[PDB]
Ligand binder design. Structure first.
Ligand SMILES: Nc1nc2c(ncn2[C@@H]2O[C@@H]3COP(=O)(O)O[C@H]4[C@@H](O)[C@H](n5cnc6c(=O)[nH]c(N)nc65)O[C@@H]4COP(=O)(O)O[C@H]3[C@H]2O)c(=O)[nH]1
Lengths: 167, 164
């Protein structure tokens, strides 16, 4: 029945819902809509999408993702989609050893969580306390859990998507 | 009572400002001059259009709105991200201002949050759900405007309006 209470969620839950709906699902639908995908003069019929959750929660995950992609020598790839007026931009491994197109992303939306955490702590000093680190790790775990639960509900995503932790 | 938990509109507005608004402003101010298809612009204005109604899929609503406004896609390169920015602009303007537009797709997430919050057992939106949706759209707009006030570029060149 009716519950007294205010609208309120973990930031990781809302950000993971958005990430699944507006990137994961459209990637899977694009790759399953085309009977075959071709990139850089090579054809791919099988795909894997790996979502890399950052090991530490930095406010700027765009920088962290750039560093991670550079370290792994992954390069940009553009995948067309009919669900959006601009294509999907992700990373892939041109050094793969199979006929599977291995795609990767580190969700930049995660960065926002850090801001939320700071407001929760009413931070008055420079530096991350072990309490802030604990809250960050808890949020990273919840983001991963929510994403995996959403992936389990979709046949496309369950077939081709995995979620791992950085390093 | 003292647990981490926020309005979805707050979280989504923070993400939208950091990972789109600010990077648009920074990319466009890096350029020594603004040019598209050989035309020169002396200013740019970025207009963020908040939806009138809260649909789960804001891309569809944005497509309808942009089609009504005869706005077309534009790709803006950026060094703040490993892929360029994609928004809409007015190719039929004649006044030397680069008119850029976006309807925040991230807003769609609010709908899901509200639906789970309502413990819905029937098809249809009660007036309480609609009131909550409108309140969340207002809070998204307010949070975005407060974030824009903290940046000289965004304060100067970004505006936030409601659809229609
Ligand atoms: N590697 C990669 N990741 C993607 C892509 N599309 C979405 N994502 C990821 O999914 C998250 C949610 O995207 P959104 O719901 O559309 O919510 C987006 C979206 O509403 C907007 N936004 C960001 N970039 C753009 C853009 O280039 N064009 C437009 N029209 N909106 C953008 O800002 C919001 C927040 O974006 P993020 O915090 O960065 O968070 C994004 C990002 O982590 C993609 O093409 N490539």
């Amino acid at each position: 029945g009716i519950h007294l209470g205010e609208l309120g969620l973990l930031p990781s839950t809302v950000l993971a819902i958005g990430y699944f709906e507006n990137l994961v699902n459209i990637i899977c639908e694009s790759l399953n809509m085309l009977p075959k995908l071709e990139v850089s003069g090579k054809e791919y019929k099988k795909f894997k999408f790996t979502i890399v959750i950052p090991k530490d929660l930095d406010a700027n995950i765009k920088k962290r993702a750039k560093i991670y992609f550079k370290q792994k020598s992954l390069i940009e790839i553009e995948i067309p989609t009919s669900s959006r007026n601009y294509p999907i931009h992700i990373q892939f491994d041109e050094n793969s050893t199979d006929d599977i197109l291995h795609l990767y992303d580190m969700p930049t939306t995660i960065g926002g969580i850090d801001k939320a955490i700071e407001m929760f702590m009413r931070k008055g000093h420079i530096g991350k306390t072990d309490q802030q680190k604990l809250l960050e790790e808890r949020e990273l775990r919840n983001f991963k859990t929510t994403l995996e639960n959403l992936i389990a509900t979709d046949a496309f995503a369950k077939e081709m998507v995995e979620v791992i932790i950085e390093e």
